[PDB]
């Protein structure tokens, strides 16, 4: 109707345990019953993105590296996080509060 959205850009360094989260998404592989976009469902209590970075399960990814993850496979969204070498740059989507 009359309700609009607000976007956030975060920069992370590649973790010793494997960052401190897990990602559900695909073009050929589903989550709910045949999915187009990549969404959050698993968070770790002692990782690098939960304590040092500032990412929550309710934040959801559109773009990774400044690269197009809106229409890709599961292995094609993990190879943007494992191949960058030491520095990974993520773009998230969240709805506007009344106060």
């Amino acid at each position: 109707g009359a309700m609009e959205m607000e976007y956030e850009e975060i920069t992370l360094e590649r973790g010793n345990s494997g960052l401190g989260f897990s990602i559900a998404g695909g073009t050929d592989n589903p989550h709910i019953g045949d999915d187009p976009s990549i969404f959050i469902t698993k968070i770790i209590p002692g990782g690098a993105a939960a304590q040092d970075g500032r990412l929550r399960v309710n934040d959801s990814i559109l773009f990774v590296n400044e690269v197009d993850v809106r229409e890709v496979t599961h292995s094609a969204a993990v190879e943007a996080l494992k191949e960058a070498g030491s520095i990974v740059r993520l773009y998230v989507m969240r709805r506007k509060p009344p106060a």
Partner: peptide
């Protein structure tokens, strides 16, 4: 749920 896997970075 029905078709998932999840275990990623």
């Amino acid at each position: 749920v029905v078709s998932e896997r999840i275990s990623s970075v």
